[PDB]
Coordinates of C-alpha atoms and ligand atoms in Angstrom, one line a residue:
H1 CA 8.3 23.1 35.4
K2 CA 7.4 24.4 38.9
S3 CA 8.4 21.1 40.6
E4 CA 10.9 18.7 39.0
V5 CA 10.3 15.9 41.6
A6 CA 6.5 16.2 41.1
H7 CA 6.9 16.1 37.3
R8 CA 9.1 12.9 37.4
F9 CA 6.7 11.3 39.9
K10 CA 3.6 11.9 37.7
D11 CA 5.5 10.7 34.6
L12 CA 7.2 7.6 35.9
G13 CA 4.5 6.4 38.3
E14 CA 5.1 5.5 42.0
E15 CA 6.3 2.0 41.4
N16 CA 8.9 3.0 38.8
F17 CA 9.9 6.1 40.8
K18 CA 10.6 4.0 43.9
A19 CA 12.6 1.4 42.1
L20 CA 14.7 4.0 40.2
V21 CA 15.4 6.0 43.4
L22 CA 16.6 2.8 45.1
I23 CA 18.9 2.1 42.1
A24 CA 20.2 5.7 42.2
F25 CA 21.3 5.6 45.8
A26 CA 22.5 2.0 45.7
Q27 CA 25.0 3.0 43.0
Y28 CA 26.4 5.8 45.2
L29 CA 26.1 4.6 48.8
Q30 CA 27.5 1.1 47.9
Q31 CA 28.3 0.1 51.5
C32 CA 25.1 1.1 53.3
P33 CA 22.9 -1.9 54.0
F34 CA 19.6 -2.6 52.2
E35 CA 17.6 -1.4 55.3
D36 CA 19.2 2.1 55.1
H37 CA 18.2 2.4 51.5
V38 CA 14.6 1.4 52.0
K39 CA 14.6 4.3 54.5
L40 CA 15.8 6.9 51.9
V41 CA 13.4 5.7 49.2
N42 CA 10.4 6.0 51.6
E43 CA 11.6 9.5 52.8
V44 CA 12.2 10.7 49.2
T45 CA 8.8 9.2 48.1
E46 CA 6.9 10.9 50.9
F47 CA 8.4 14.2 50.0
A48 CA 7.6 13.7 46.3
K49 CA 3.9 13.0 47.1
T50 CA 3.7 16.3 49.0
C51 CA 4.9 18.1 45.8
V52 CA 2.3 16.2 43.7
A53 CA -0.4 17.3 46.2
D54 CA 0.9 20.9 46.0
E55 CA 3.6 21.9 43.6
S56 CA 4.5 25.0 45.6
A57 CA 4.9 23.3 49.0
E58 CA 8.3 23.9 50.6
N59 CA 11.5 22.6 48.9
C60 CA 9.3 21.4 46.0
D61 CA 10.9 23.9 43.6
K62 CA 14.5 22.5 44.3
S63 CA 16.2 20.7 41.5
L64 CA 16.4 16.9 41.6
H65 CA 20.2 17.2 41.5
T66 CA 20.0 19.5 44.6
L67 CA 17.6 17.1 46.4
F68 CA 19.7 14.1 45.6
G69 CA 23.0 15.7 46.9
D70 CA 21.3 17.1 50.1
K71 CA 20.0 13.6 50.9
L72 CA 23.5 12.1 50.2
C73 CA 24.9 14.7 52.6
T74 CA 22.6 13.8 55.5
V75 CA 23.9 10.3 55.7
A76 CA 25.4 10.0 59.2
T77 CA 28.4 7.8 58.5
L78 CA 29.3 9.5 55.2
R79 CA 32.7 10.7 56.4
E80 CA 33.3 7.5 58.4
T81 CA 32.6 5.1 55.6
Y82 CA 33.3 6.8 52.2
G83 CA 36.0 9.3 53.4
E84 CA 36.8 11.7 50.5
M85 CA 33.2 11.6 49.3
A86 CA 32.0 13.5 52.3
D87 CA 34.2 16.5 51.3
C88 CA 31.9 17.0 48.3
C89 CA 29.2 18.2 50.8
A90 CA 31.4 21.3 51.6
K91 CA 30.8 22.6 48.0
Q92 CA 28.1 24.7 46.4
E93 CA 26.1 23.3 43.4
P94 CA 27.0 22.6 40.7
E95 CA 30.6 21.8 41.8
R96 CA 29.1 19.5 44.5
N97 CA 27.2 17.4 41.9
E98 CA 30.4 17.1 39.8
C99 CA 32.3 16.1 42.9
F100 CA 30.0 13.1 43.6
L101 CA 30.5 11.8 40.0
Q102 CA 34.2 11.3 40.6
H103 CA 33.9 9.2 43.8
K104 CA 32.0 6.1 42.9
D105 CA 33.7 2.7 43.0
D106 CA 34.2 0.4 40.0
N107 CA 35.5 -2.4 42.2
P108 CA 33.6 -2.4 45.6
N109 CA 35.3 -5.4 47.2
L110 CA 32.0 -7.1 48.1
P111 CA 31.4 -10.9 48.2
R112 CA 30.3 -12.9 45.2
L113 CA 26.5 -13.1 44.9
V114 CA 25.4 -16.7 45.6
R115 CA 22.4 -18.2 43.8
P116 CA 20.3 -19.8 46.6
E117 CA 18.3 -23.0 46.1
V118 CA 15.2 -22.8 43.9
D119 CA 12.9 -23.6 46.8
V120 CA 14.7 -21.0 49.0
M121 CA 14.0 -18.4 46.3
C122 CA 10.4 -19.4 45.5
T123 CA 9.5 -19.3 49.2
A124 CA 11.2 -15.9 49.5
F125 CA 9.4 -14.7 46.3
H126 CA 6.0 -15.9 47.6
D127 CA 6.5 -14.5 51.1
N128 CA 7.7 -10.9 50.6
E129 CA 7.9 -10.5 46.8
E130 CA 8.9 -6.8 46.9
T131 CA 11.5 -7.2 49.6
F132 CA 12.9 -10.1 47.6
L133 CA 13.0 -8.4 44.2
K134 CA 14.3 -5.1 45.5
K135 CA 17.1 -6.6 47.6
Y136 CA 18.5 -8.3 44.5
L137 CA 18.0 -4.9 42.7
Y138 CA 20.1 -3.3 45.5
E139 CA 22.8 -6.0 45.3
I140 CA 23.3 -5.7 41.5
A141 CA 23.3 -1.9 41.4
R142 CA 25.9 -1.6 44.2
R143 CA 28.2 -4.0 42.2
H144 CA 27.6 -2.3 38.8
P145 CA 27.5 1.4 39.8
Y146 CA 27.8 2.5 36.2
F147 CA 24.8 0.4 34.9
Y148 CA 22.2 2.7 33.3
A149 CA 19.4 2.7 36.0
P150 CA 16.3 2.3 33.7
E151 CA 17.9 -0.7 31.9
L152 CA 18.6 -2.3 35.3
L153 CA 14.9 -1.8 36.1
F154 CA 13.9 -3.5 32.9
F155 CA 16.0 -6.5 33.8
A156 CA 14.3 -6.6 37.3
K157 CA 10.9 -6.8 35.6
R158 CA 12.1 -9.9 33.6
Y159 CA 13.4 -11.5 36.8
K160 CA 9.9 -11.0 38.2
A161 CA 8.3 -12.7 35.2
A162 CA 10.5 -15.8 35.6
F163 CA 9.8 -16.3 39.3
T164 CA 6.1 -15.6 38.7
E165 CA 5.9 -18.4 36.1
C166 CA 8.3 -21.0 37.4
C167 CA 7.7 -21.0 41.2
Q168 CA 4.3 -22.6 40.3
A169 CA 5.4 -25.2 37.6
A170 CA 5.9 -28.9 38.3
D171 CA 9.7 -28.9 38.0
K172 CA 10.5 -25.5 39.4
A173 CA 14.3 -25.8 38.8
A174 CA 13.7 -27.0 35.2
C175 CA 11.7 -23.9 34.4
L176 CA 13.6 -21.3 36.4
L177 CA 17.3 -22.2 36.0
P178 CA 17.8 -21.7 32.2
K179 CA 15.9 -18.3 32.5
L180 CA 18.2 -17.2 35.4
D181 CA 21.2 -18.3 33.2
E182 CA 20.0 -16.3 30.1
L183 CA 19.2 -13.1 32.2
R184 CA 22.6 -13.2 33.9
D185 CA 24.6 -13.6 30.7
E186 CA 22.5 -10.9 28.9
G187 CA 22.9 -8.5 31.9
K188 CA 26.7 -9.1 31.9
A189 CA 26.9 -8.5 28.2
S190 CA 24.9 -5.3 28.5
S191 CA 27.1 -4.1 31.3
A192 CA 30.4 -4.8 29.3
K193 CA 28.9 -3.2 26.2
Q194 CA 28.0 0.0 28.1
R195 CA 31.5 0.5 29.5
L196 CA 33.1 -0.6 26.2
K197 CA 31.2 2.1 24.3
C198 CA 32.4 4.9 26.6
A199 CA 36.0 3.4 26.5
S200 CA 35.8 3.4 22.7
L201 CA 34.5 7.0 22.5
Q202 CA 37.7 8.2 24.4
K203 CA 40.1 5.7 22.8
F204 CA 39.2 6.2 19.1
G205 CA 37.6 9.7 19.0
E206 CA 34.4 11.4 17.7
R207 CA 35.1 10.8 14.0
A208 CA 35.2 7.0 14.5
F209 CA 32.0 7.3 16.4
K210 CA 30.2 9.3 13.8
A211 CA 31.2 6.8 11.1
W212 CA 30.0 3.8 13.1
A213 CA 26.6 5.5 13.8
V214 CA 26.0 6.6 10.2
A215 CA 26.4 3.1 9.1
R216 CA 24.3 1.6 11.8
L217 CA 21.5 4.1 11.6
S218 CA 21.4 3.8 7.8
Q219 CA 20.8 0.0 8.1
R220 CA 18.0 0.5 10.6
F221 CA 16.3 3.5 8.8
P222 CA 17.0 2.8 5.1
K223 CA 14.1 5.1 3.9
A224 CA 15.4 8.1 5.8
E225 CA 17.3 10.8 3.9
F226 CA 21.0 11.4 4.4
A227 CA 20.4 14.7 6.1
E228 CA 18.0 13.2 8.6
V229 CA 20.5 10.3 9.3
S230 CA 23.3 12.8 9.8
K231 CA 21.1 15.0 12.1
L232 CA 20.3 11.9 14.2
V233 CA 24.0 11.1 14.4
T234 CA 24.9 14.6 15.5
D235 CA 22.5 14.3 18.5
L236 CA 23.5 10.7 19.4
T237 CA 27.1 11.9 19.6
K238 CA 25.9 14.5 22.2
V239 CA 23.8 11.9 24.0
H240 CA 26.7 9.3 24.3
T241 CA 29.1 12.1 25.3
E242 CA 26.8 13.3 28.1
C243 CA 25.9 9.7 29.3
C244 CA 29.6 8.7 29.4
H245 CA 30.3 11.7 31.6
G246 CA 28.2 9.8 34.2
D247 CA 25.3 12.1 35.3
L248 CA 22.1 9.8 35.4
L249 CA 19.5 12.6 35.1
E250 CA 21.3 14.4 32.3
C251 CA 21.7 11.1 30.4
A252 CA 18.0 10.4 30.9
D253 CA 16.9 13.8 29.6
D254 CA 19.1 13.7 26.5
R255 CA 17.9 10.2 25.7
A256 CA 14.2 11.1 26.3
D257 CA 14.5 14.3 24.1
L258 CA 16.0 12.3 21.2
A259 CA 13.1 9.7 21.5
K260 CA 10.6 12.6 21.3
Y261 CA 12.2 14.1 18.2
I262 CA 12.2 10.7 16.5
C263 CA 8.5 10.0 17.5
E264 CA 7.4 13.4 16.2
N265 CA 9.1 12.6 12.9
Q266 CA 8.3 8.9 12.1
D267 CA 7.3 9.9 8.6
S268 CA 10.9 10.9 7.8
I269 CA 12.6 8.0 9.7
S270 CA 11.0 4.6 9.8
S271 CA 7.7 2.8 9.4
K272 CA 8.4 0.4 12.3
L273 CA 8.2 3.0 15.2
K274 CA 4.5 3.3 15.7
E275 CA 4.4 0.9 18.7
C276 CA 7.5 2.2 20.4
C277 CA 6.1 5.7 20.1
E278 CA 3.0 4.9 22.1
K279 CA 4.9 3.6 25.1
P280 CA 5.5 5.7 28.2
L281 CA 8.5 7.9 28.5
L282 CA 10.5 5.4 30.6
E283 CA 10.5 2.8 27.8
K284 CA 10.5 4.8 24.6
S285 CA 14.2 5.2 24.0
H286 CA 15.0 1.6 24.9
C287 CA 12.2 0.4 22.6
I288 CA 13.5 2.5 19.7
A289 CA 17.1 1.2 20.1
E290 CA 15.8 -2.3 19.5
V291 CA 13.2 -1.7 16.7
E292 CA 13.8 -4.0 13.7
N293 CA 15.2 -2.6 10.5
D294 CA 12.8 -0.9 8.1
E295 CA 12.3 -2.4 4.7
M296 CA 14.7 -0.6 2.3
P297 CA 13.2 1.4 -0.7
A298 CA 12.5 -0.9 -3.6
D299 CA 14.7 -0.6 -6.8
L300 CA 17.6 1.5 -5.5
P301 CA 20.3 2.6 -8.1
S302 CA 23.7 1.0 -8.3
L303 CA 26.2 3.0 -6.2
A304 CA 28.1 3.3 -9.5
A305 CA 26.3 6.4 -10.7
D306 CA 27.2 8.8 -7.9
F307 CA 30.5 7.2 -6.8
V308 CA 32.3 6.0 -9.9
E309 CA 30.8 7.2 -13.2
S310 CA 29.7 10.8 -12.4
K311 CA 32.1 13.6 -13.5
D312 CA 32.0 15.3 -10.1
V313 CA 33.3 12.5 -7.9
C314 CA 36.6 14.3 -7.0
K315 CA 35.0 17.8 -6.9
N316 CA 32.1 16.6 -4.6
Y317 CA 34.7 14.8 -2.5
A318 CA 37.3 17.6 -2.0
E319 CA 34.5 20.1 -1.0
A320 CA 33.7 18.1 2.1
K321 CA 35.5 14.7 2.4
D322 CA 33.8 13.3 5.5
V323 CA 30.5 14.4 4.3
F324 CA 31.1 12.7 0.9
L325 CA 32.6 9.7 2.6
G326 CA 29.5 9.5 5.0
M327 CA 27.1 9.6 2.0
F328 CA 29.0 6.6 0.6
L329 CA 28.6 4.9 4.0
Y330 CA 24.9 5.8 4.1
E331 CA 24.2 4.5 0.5
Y332 CA 26.2 1.3 1.1
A333 CA 24.8 0.5 4.6
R334 CA 21.1 1.1 3.6
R335 CA 21.5 -1.6 0.8
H336 CA 23.4 -3.9 3.2
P337 CA 21.7 -4.5 6.6
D338 CA 23.3 -8.0 6.4
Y339 CA 26.8 -6.5 6.9
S340 CA 28.7 -5.9 10.1
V341 CA 29.2 -2.2 10.7
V342 CA 33.0 -2.7 10.8
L343 CA 32.8 -4.3 7.3
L344 CA 31.1 -1.2 6.0
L345 CA 33.8 0.9 7.7
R346 CA 36.5 -1.2 5.9
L347 CA 34.8 -0.6 2.6
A348 CA 34.5 3.2 3.3
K349 CA 38.2 3.2 4.3
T350 CA 39.0 1.5 1.0
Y351 CA 37.0 4.0 -1.0
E352 CA 38.7 6.9 1.0
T353 CA 42.2 5.5 0.2
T354 CA 41.4 5.2 -3.5
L355 CA 40.0 8.7 -3.8
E356 CA 43.0 10.1 -2.0
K357 CA 45.2 8.4 -4.6
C358 CA 43.1 8.9 -7.8
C359 CA 41.7 12.4 -7.3
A360 CA 45.3 13.7 -7.7
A361 CA 45.5 11.8 -11.1
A362 CA 45.1 13.5 -14.5
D363 CA 42.2 11.1 -15.3
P364 CA 40.6 10.2 -12.0
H365 CA 37.9 8.2 -13.7
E366 CA 40.6 5.9 -15.2
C367 CA 42.4 5.5 -11.9
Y368 CA 39.4 4.7 -9.6
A369 CA 37.6 2.8 -12.3
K370 CA 37.9 -0.6 -10.6
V371 CA 37.4 0.4 -7.0
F372 CA 34.4 -1.9 -6.4
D373 CA 36.5 -4.9 -7.3
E374 CA 38.5 -4.1 -4.2
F375 CA 35.4 -4.7 -2.1
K376 CA 34.8 -8.4 -3.0
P377 CA 37.7 -9.9 -0.9
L378 CA 36.8 -7.8 2.2
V379 CA 33.1 -8.9 1.9
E380 CA 33.9 -12.6 1.6
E381 CA 36.5 -13.0 4.4
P382 CA 33.9 -12.6 7.2
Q383 CA 31.1 -14.3 5.2
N384 CA 33.3 -17.4 4.8
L385 CA 34.3 -17.4 8.5
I386 CA 30.6 -17.2 9.4
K387 CA 29.3 -19.8 7.0
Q388 CA 32.0 -22.3 8.1
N389 CA 32.0 -21.8 11.8
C390 CA 28.2 -21.8 11.9
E391 CA 28.2 -25.1 10.0
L392 CA 30.2 -26.7 12.9
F393 CA 27.8 -25.3 15.5
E394 CA 24.9 -26.9 13.6
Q395 CA 27.1 -30.0 13.3
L396 CA 28.2 -30.5 17.0
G397 CA 26.0 -28.7 19.4
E398 CA 27.2 -26.0 21.8
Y399 CA 29.3 -28.2 24.1
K400 CA 31.1 -30.1 21.4
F401 CA 31.5 -26.9 19.5
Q402 CA 33.1 -25.4 22.5
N403 CA 35.6 -28.3 22.7
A404 CA 36.6 -27.8 19.1
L405 CA 37.4 -24.2 19.9
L406 CA 39.5 -25.1 22.9
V407 CA 41.7 -27.3 20.8
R408 CA 42.0 -24.7 18.0
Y409 CA 42.8 -21.8 20.4
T410 CA 45.1 -23.6 22.7
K411 CA 47.0 -24.8 19.6
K412 CA 47.2 -21.2 18.4
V413 CA 48.3 -19.5 21.7
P414 CA 49.2 -22.3 24.2
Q415 CA 50.7 -20.0 26.7
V416 CA 47.3 -18.4 27.6
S417 CA 46.2 -19.5 31.1
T418 CA 43.8 -22.5 31.2
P419 CA 41.0 -20.6 32.9
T420 CA 41.1 -17.8 30.3
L421 CA 41.3 -20.4 27.5
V422 CA 38.3 -22.1 29.0
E423 CA 36.2 -19.0 29.8
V424 CA 36.7 -17.4 26.4
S425 CA 36.2 -20.6 24.4
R426 CA 33.0 -21.3 26.2
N427 CA 31.9 -17.7 25.5
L428 CA 32.7 -18.0 21.8
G429 CA 30.5 -21.1 21.8
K430 CA 27.7 -19.0 23.2
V431 CA 28.2 -16.5 20.3
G432 CA 27.5 -19.5 18.1
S433 CA 24.2 -20.1 20.0
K434 CA 22.9 -16.5 19.9
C435 CA 23.8 -16.0 16.2
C436 CA 23.8 -19.2 14.1
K437 CA 20.1 -19.4 15.0
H438 CA 19.5 -16.2 12.9
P439 CA 19.0 -16.3 9.1
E440 CA 22.0 -15.2 7.0
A441 CA 20.8 -11.6 6.9
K442 CA 21.1 -11.2 10.7
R443 CA 24.3 -13.3 11.1
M444 CA 27.2 -10.8 10.7
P445 CA 25.5 -8.1 12.9
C446 CA 24.8 -10.6 15.6
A447 CA 28.3 -12.1 15.6
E448 CA 29.8 -8.5 15.6
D449 CA 27.8 -7.3 18.6
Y450 CA 28.7 -10.3 20.8
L451 CA 32.3 -10.8 19.5
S452 CA 33.2 -7.3 20.4
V453 CA 32.6 -8.0 24.1
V454 CA 34.0 -11.5 24.1
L455 CA 37.2 -10.4 22.4
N456 CA 37.4 -7.4 24.6
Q457 CA 37.1 -9.5 27.7
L458 CA 40.0 -11.7 26.3
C459 CA 42.2 -8.6 25.8
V460 CA 41.4 -7.2 29.3
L461 CA 42.3 -10.6 30.8
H462 CA 45.4 -10.5 28.6
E463 CA 46.8 -7.1 29.7
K464 CA 47.1 -8.6 33.1
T465 CA 48.9 -11.9 32.4
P466 CA 50.6 -11.1 29.1
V467 CA 52.0 -14.3 27.6
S468 CA 51.9 -13.5 23.9
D469 CA 53.2 -10.7 21.7
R470 CA 50.9 -11.7 18.8
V471 CA 47.8 -11.5 21.1
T472 CA 49.0 -8.1 22.4
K473 CA 49.4 -6.9 18.8
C474 CA 45.8 -7.7 17.9
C475 CA 44.5 -6.2 21.1
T476 CA 46.1 -2.9 20.2
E477 CA 45.4 -2.9 16.5
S478 CA 43.0 -0.5 14.8
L479 CA 39.2 -0.7 15.2
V480 CA 38.8 -2.4 11.8
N481 CA 41.9 -4.7 12.1
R482 CA 41.2 -6.2 15.6
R483 CA 38.9 -9.1 14.6
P484 CA 40.8 -9.9 11.3
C485 CA 44.1 -9.9 13.3
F486 CA 42.7 -12.5 15.7
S487 CA 41.4 -14.6 12.8
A488 CA 44.9 -14.6 11.1
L489 CA 46.9 -16.0 14.0
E490 CA 48.7 -19.3 13.1
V491 CA 49.2 -22.4 15.4
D492 CA 52.3 -22.1 17.6
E493 CA 54.7 -24.6 15.9
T494 CA 57.7 -23.1 17.8
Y495 CA 56.2 -24.2 21.2
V496 CA 57.6 -26.6 23.8
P497 CA 55.3 -29.3 25.1
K498 CA 54.2 -28.6 28.7
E499 CA 55.8 -30.7 31.4
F500 CA 53.7 -33.7 32.4
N501 CA 51.9 -33.5 35.7
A502 CA 50.3 -36.8 36.9
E503 CA 47.9 -35.0 39.3
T504 CA 46.5 -32.8 36.5
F505 CA 45.0 -35.8 34.6
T506 CA 44.0 -37.6 37.9
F507 CA 40.2 -37.8 38.5
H508 CA 38.8 -39.0 41.9
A509 CA 35.2 -39.8 40.8
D510 CA 34.4 -36.5 42.4
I511 CA 33.4 -36.2 38.7
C512 CA 30.3 -38.4 38.6
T513 CA 28.2 -36.3 41.0
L514 CA 29.2 -32.8 40.0
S515 CA 26.8 -30.4 38.3
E516 CA 26.9 -30.9 34.5
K517 CA 28.3 -27.3 34.3
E518 CA 31.2 -28.2 36.6
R519 CA 31.6 -31.6 34.8
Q520 CA 32.0 -29.7 31.5
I521 CA 34.6 -27.2 32.9
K522 CA 36.6 -30.0 34.5
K523 CA 36.6 -32.1 31.2
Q524 CA 37.4 -28.9 29.3
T525 CA 40.2 -27.8 31.7
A526 CA 41.9 -31.2 31.2
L527 CA 41.3 -31.1 27.4
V528 CA 43.3 -27.9 27.4
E529 CA 46.0 -29.5 29.6
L530 CA 46.0 -32.5 27.3
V531 CA 46.7 -30.2 24.3
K532 CA 49.2 -28.2 26.3
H533 CA 51.4 -31.2 27.0
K534 CA 50.9 -32.9 23.6
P535 CA 50.6 -30.0 21.1
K536 CA 51.6 -32.2 18.2
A537 CA 48.6 -34.6 18.5
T538 CA 46.5 -34.9 15.3
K539 CA 42.8 -34.4 14.8
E540 CA 41.9 -38.2 14.4
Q541 CA 44.6 -39.0 17.0
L542 CA 43.3 -36.7 19.6
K543 CA 39.7 -38.1 19.0
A544 CA 41.4 -41.3 20.1
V545 CA 42.5 -40.1 23.5
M546 CA 39.2 -38.2 23.9
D547 CA 37.1 -41.4 23.3
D548 CA 39.3 -43.4 25.7
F549 CA 38.2 -40.9 28.4
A550 CA 34.6 -40.9 27.1
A551 CA 34.1 -44.6 28.0
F552 CA 36.7 -44.7 30.8
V553 CA 35.0 -42.1 33.0
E554 CA 31.7 -43.8 32.5
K555 CA 32.6 -47.4 33.7
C556 CA 34.7 -46.2 36.7
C557 CA 31.6 -44.1 37.8
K558 CA 28.8 -46.7 37.8
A559 CA 28.4 -47.3 41.6
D560 CA 31.0 -49.8 43.0
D561 CA 34.7 -49.5 43.7
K562 CA 34.7 -46.1 42.0
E563 CA 37.7 -44.9 44.0
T564 CA 40.3 -47.4 42.8
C565 CA 38.9 -47.8 39.3
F566 CA 39.9 -44.1 38.8
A567 CA 43.2 -45.2 40.5
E568 CA 43.8 -48.3 38.3
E569 CA 42.4 -47.7 34.8
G570 CA 43.4 -44.1 35.2
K571 CA 47.1 -44.8 35.3
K572 CA 46.1 -47.1 32.5
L573 CA 44.5 -44.2 30.6
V574 CA 47.4 -41.8 31.2
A575 CA 50.2 -44.3 30.1
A576 CA 48.5 -45.5 26.9
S577 CA 48.1 -41.8 25.8
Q578 CA 51.6 -40.5 26.4
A579 CA 53.2 -43.2 24.2
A580 CA 50.3 -42.7 21.7
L581 CA 51.1 -39.0 21.4
Ligands
4TX601 C1 33.9 3.7 17.3 C2 32.9 3.9 18.4 C3 33.1 4.7 19.5 C4 32.2 4.9 20.5 C5 30.9 4.2 20.4 C6 29.8 4.4 21.4 C7 30.7 3.4 19.3 O1 29.4 2.7 19.2 C8 28.6 3.5 18.4 C9 27.3 3.5 19.2 C10 26.3 2.6 18.6 C11 24.9 3.1 18.7 C12 24.8 4.4 17.9 C13 24.4 3.4 20.1 C14 23.9 2.2 18.0 O2 24.2 1.0 17.6 O3 22.6 2.6 18.0 C15 31.7 3.2 18.3
4TX602 C1 40.4 -18.3 23.9 C2 41.3 -17.6 22.8 C3 42.6 -17.6 23.1 C4 43.4 -17.0 22.1 C5 42.9 -16.5 21.0 C6 43.8 -15.8 20.0 C7 41.5 -16.5 20.7 O1 41.0 -16.0 19.5 C8 39.7 -16.1 19.2 C9 39.4 -15.6 17.8 C10 37.9 -15.7 17.5 C11 37.4 -15.5 16.0 C12 37.6 -14.1 15.6 C13 36.0 -16.0 15.9 C14 38.3 -16.4 15.1 O2 38.6 -17.6 15.5 O3 38.8 -16.0 14.0 C15 40.7 -17.1 21.6
MYR603 C1 16.5 10.9 42.9 C2 15.7 10.7 41.7 C3 16.4 9.9 40.6 C4 15.4 9.6 39.5 C5 16.0 9.0 38.2 C6 15.0 8.4 37.3 C7 14.8 9.0 36.0 C8 15.5 8.3 34.9 C9 14.6 7.6 34.0 C10 14.1 8.4 32.9 C11 13.3 7.6 31.9 C12 14.1 7.0 30.8 C13 14.6 8.0 29.8 C14 15.2 7.4 28.6 O1 16.3 6.8 28.7 O2 14.6 7.4 27.4
MYR604 C1 33.5 -19.1 17.1 C2 32.1 -18.8 16.9 C3 31.8 -17.3 16.7 C4 30.7 -17.1 15.7 C5 31.0 -17.5 14.3 C6 32.2 -16.8 13.7 C7 31.9 -15.4 13.2 C8 32.8 -14.8 12.3 C9 33.0 -13.3 12.4 C10 32.6 -12.6 11.1 C11 32.2 -11.2 11.4 C12 33.0 -10.4 12.4 C13 32.8 -9.0 12.3 C14 33.9 -8.4 11.3 O1 35.1 -8.3 11.7 O2 33.5 -8.0 10.2

């Protein structure tokens, strides 16, 4: 209205406003120390409060984009520190705003953030809670300058909950450390998913995006009508396109506007939105993105009527193909919330191929008559992969599951580096955890969401140490072919066992006192190495060498002459194994 800064202040509230302003500057002034940022926040906050007191006070009618840039431009070492960024200040708005968007830093070469000791954290949290929370807010934002600010704030609030609860329990570290572990992983996945969505919008184009969204929205809002779903999809395409361009306030406005539309139209969308639609602006859109699926309408027709039997299949289709294809997607997805989106895209692509062929025939009905038979194999390939894999995760536990993967994937592509093999296999294990805990109906969606980041991370690592043609092929396959391509790779039978290195298999009882995390990685590294030298070992025959180590490392670790037990029985464990494999 009259004062944008006043409006935002009154809507977010002071606490939220302060945290968001800190995030906003942190992501642009990535090198300025925490103290300089607290300074800007307080200066910006004092000015806001003057505009809340009196909306027509001086400078209160300036745009928030204008006020943000001005404040960026008053930083004294701007030219010194950020170089080219300072030349943005020589421009008029809106070219100045656009100039700042281009000069952030994806890789600020800052040191790794080190998790202090539990008691060092709980005493810092008790002493100056705000200073403690906000510094960590600063450190994350400057390292993820593209992370959507409100989402980062919601994480911060969770961090607060964990420290509040655990810094008072008997075993602090037992309470706090799994929580820190979950939050970090979930924040890393959210960050990768955000950048991957924008990368996918450019790589694959707007058609692919609309197809994906139709399917997803139809699963979540099965009672909505096609036209309403398609109207939602049109807007979300704008929103994602704006957000990916990078301007935080424009992204926030577009998201907030969509949430308002949806909340003013719950009757046409979903019966599960009531609670989200009571929450304050800051949380509404995030709440909606996570709402559970509506119950689908009872007693829906077979898709056969409108898509196989009807006389006007080919006539309906040729009039507007993507509309007709999107109605198919809509009708299939609403009945199938248990499917992955990509599966639904494979079915729609199958239907599209058949109509392209058969609508040219003299008797289209005769040609496309058996099109639904073509769906059965596509549906069962990923259901079988889920059922089977999730049986093993229920049958081994995370760690042993992880070990089974290491063997499988090293045997498949034994040229991949050991750290990549280890990182990715461990992550795949964690996909098991997040997803096999869900009932059938939620399995394929869960696996799809997390696989997409895990497999992407594997591909990104792979572009930079390319050892395998077959891996490269799957990383540059189509959207729908990527995961099936991975699943299809055969064991490398034409491989050459890796040269033996005595040191690689040598443990120096360093092992008995390491964190369990490190003990796992070390065991897992060697397991990979084991398989890299002896690729031809058999299931039951490997379990042999593995169970030698099982007992070995246990007896040479019980306090005593550790040092030479790992020197003696070790050369004894190496030698027995080479001849046995
Ligand atoms: C092919 C492609 C290209 C670009 C993007 C962003 C894609 O993801 C769709 C966004 C998913 C959405 C709509 C946010 C949801 O699940 O609610 C897919
Ligand atoms: C660590 C690594 C190295 C090399 C490859 C090829 C990997 O592929 C993982 C495919 C995962 C999936 C889709 C669940 C499957 O097994 O079918 C993994
Ligand atoms: C310098 C002022 C920067 C202020 C940025 C904070 C406003 C962004 C949050 C808007 C609330 C969330 C909207 C939404 O995503 O639904
Ligand atoms: C290795 C553990 C990962 C979790 C269990 C395997 C999941 C199989 C994936 C099936 C669905 C993938 C999505 C798709 O391509 O349709």
